[PDB]
């Protein structure tokens, strides 16, 4: 048995955390929780939440409200340097893209996060942004490590080095050095705009996408858009000292933050991702498959995907989980 720092967050976050916990309970998963709270206090994160995460080394996180952002603090505190978003078409959930199985791996310390804007003269704004050899090397090595450890054949570096020669070219040169080492993984490179162009025509051609943060997270949202949105998209951040936080990337949902209408799929799958990161592959697969089969049925869905409430959807998963 092992311990996981749980951050339910605001809005629907509690409802969906209780729904995830109940499912992990009904799975006999080697996982007990250590619920904590997160809050900017004078500027850093609470002593109890920091120490919890330092001990447990693994976190799960629901949707937070913006006030310094808490996501900024978490990323700063634990040096969360690699954002990972796996996007896979859901059998029961109908989008026009069904062949989708892509993992985006995104540098998470610099680029736009280093961003300074200022007024040069009246009506002229300059932005300043940074790209480092270190952080580029770091995210590159990670991406291949991820691909090897998750049985992924191809890694594509996504860039605009044709325009940003110095900064995306650096990124590219560090990806090649890593690709020289890890000759077992198929490596290619593609312009961001070409990636985008091809993505929406035939997304099946793409496997793992490594990219810097210079232009932000735009491609991850696009990929998520193909499979049905942020309401069903899992996500995880990997830091230094073996820290890893898994999270939902959907909104706080204030409008139904008291009701039973919520949908915990995304947070559930991030937890599934967490189990796999620990090595608990058996339970991961069973909770995963339970969720997908429940979605495939069509008679038990939330109001955002039928008419059934959250607990009905949560309970119908739990019923299927128990089938060992």
């Amino acid at each position: 048995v092992q311990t996981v720092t749980l951050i339910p967050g605001d809005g629907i976050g509690p409802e969906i955390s209780a729904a995830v916990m109940k499912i992990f309970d009904a799975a006999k998963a080697p996982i007990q929780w250590e619920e904590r709270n997160v809050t900017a206090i004078q500027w850093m994160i609470p002593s109890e939440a920091k120490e919890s995460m330092d001990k447990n080394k693994m976190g799960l996180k629901g949707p937070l409200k913006t006030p310094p952002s808490m996501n900024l603090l978490l990323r700063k505190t634990f040096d969360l340097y690699a954002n990972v978003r796996p996007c896979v078409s859901i059998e029961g959930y109908k989008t026009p893209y069904t062949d989708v199985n892509i993992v985006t791996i995104r540098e998470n310390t610099e680029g736009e996060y280093s961003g300074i804007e200022h007024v040069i003269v009246d009506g002229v704004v300059q932005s300043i942004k940074l790209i480092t050899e270190g952080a580029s090397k770091r995210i590159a090595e990670f991406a291949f490590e991820y691909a090897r450890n998750n049985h992924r054949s191809n890694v594509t570096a996504v860039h605009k080095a044709n325009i940003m020669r110095m900064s995306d070219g650096l990124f590219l040169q560090k990806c090649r050095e890593v690709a020289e080492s890890c000759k077992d993984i198929k490596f290619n490179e593609m312009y961001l705009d070409t990636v985008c162009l091809n993505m929406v025509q035939d997304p099946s051609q793409f496997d793992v996408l490594v990219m810097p943060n210079l232009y932000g997270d735009i491609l991850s949202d696009l990929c998520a858009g193909l499979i049905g949105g942020l309401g069903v998209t899992p996500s995880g951040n990997i830091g230094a000292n073996g820290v890893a936080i898994f999270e939902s990337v959907h909104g706080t949902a204030p409008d139904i933050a008291g009701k039973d209408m919520a949908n915990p799929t995304a947070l559930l799958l991030s937890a599934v991702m967490m189990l796999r990161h620990m090595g608990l592959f058996d339970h991961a697969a069973r909770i995963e498959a339970a969720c997908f089969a429940t979605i495939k049925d069509g008679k038990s869905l939330t109001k955002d995907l039928g008419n059934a409430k959250c607990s009905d959807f949560t309970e119908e998963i739990c019923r299927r989980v128990k089938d060992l």
Binding site: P96, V125, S127, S167, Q201, I218, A224
Partner: protein, 335 residues
């Protein structure tokens, strides 16, 4: 008779230019092409010479010049030097669902107006401390105002009802905030046009789910690059969509996605539709509207027939066979 500069470019550009000339002869288009070549050269005297040709003729049709990104940062994109030197400030593309080309979405009709000069395209990079590349990018009121001005005017003149500014002012509060405030400034003078705004991240998710919501979109340079390719992808890909680059006085026409097509060059499989439609936009701009119309109808009629399709849209036809069909359709309305 008009004289038009022609830059064949790399990849599929030269082979498609031949078909353009061929189609103009069959349509009896009163246009003469003055060819200027632009290598991706270490030298610049060519690009300086090509700029002169465009200042002279005021109108050009061009293929895409390939940028070797393995060259040092002193060697810059010749496409970008070309468009910024001439101050061709408005990149505009029209993505419209084609009845004959079936994709995952239909009823798409989007005009994208993209600021074509500043942002990361005119940025400065330096490595003052080893292993740290710093990027300094500029966005300005003057350029944001005129792109918004262009987009609203175009919307009004085309009988369109809504302009959506795409941006990331949630993150880039000063720069993208200024861009957005410039659009709103112009919006107040077009009270007949609905004005909306949307974050670029969210915009991509909306396009792959419900792209029918968008009408006219206006944005700075980088988001334009992304949105152009997404929208072009949704309607059938890079083979189909024409692109224009407008200045106050000069105008240059190209394929919307600005692809060289090196991998498919010299195999008689390139889709000629984007290039021909670009040549039609160019004829409209020269007030040769009857010619543009005949040709545009011809290419739209051929694409209505899946037997004419090239491999990029699932077909098996050659470039020359598609051209044959276009020429056949000109001749039918021709006499």
């Amino acid at each position: 008779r008009h004289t038009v500069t022609m830059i064949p470019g790399d990849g599929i550009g030269p082979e498609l230019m031949l078909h353009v000339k061929s189609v103009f002869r069959h349509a009896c288009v009163p246009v003469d092409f003055e060819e200027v070549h632009v290598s991706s050269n270490a030298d610049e005297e060519d690009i300086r010479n090509a700029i002169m040709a465009i200042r002279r003729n005021r109108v050009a049709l061009k293929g895409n010049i390939e940028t070797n990104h393995n060259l040092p940062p002193s060697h810059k994109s010749r496409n970008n030097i070309l468009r910024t030197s001439l101050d061709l400030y408005a990149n505009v593309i029209h993505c419209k669902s084609l009845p004959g080309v079936v994709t995952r979405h239909k009823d798409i009709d989007i005009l994208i107006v993209r600021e074509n000069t500043e942002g990361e395209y005119s940025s400065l990079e330096h490595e003052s401390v080893a292993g740290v590349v710093e990027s300094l990018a500029i966005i300005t009121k003057a350029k944001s105002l005129r792109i918004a001005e262009y987009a609203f005017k175009l919307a009004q003149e085309s009988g369109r009802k809504k302009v959506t500014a795409v941006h990331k002012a949630n993150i880039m509060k000063l720069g993208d905030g200024l861009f957005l405030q410039c659009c709103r400034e112009v919006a107040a003078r077009y009270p007949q046009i609905t004005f909306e705004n949307m974050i670029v991240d969210n915009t991509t998710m909306q396009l792959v789910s419900r792209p029918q919501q968008f009408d006219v979109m206006v944005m700075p340079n980088l988001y334009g690059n992304i949105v152009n390719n997404v929208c072009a992808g949704l309607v059938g890909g890079p083979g189909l969509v024409a692109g224009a680059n407008y200045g106050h006085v000069y105008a240059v026409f190209e394929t919307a996605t600005r692809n060289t097509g090196k991998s498919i060059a010299n195999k008689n499989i390139a889709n000629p539709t984007a290039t021909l439609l670009a040549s039609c936009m160019m004829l409209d701009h020269l007030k040769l509207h009857s010619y543009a119309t005949s040709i545009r109808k011809a290419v739209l009629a051929s694409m209505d027939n899946e037997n004419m399709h090239t491999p990029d849209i699932g077909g098996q036809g050659t470039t020359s066979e598609a051209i044959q069909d276009v020429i056949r359709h000109i001749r039918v309305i021709n006499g």
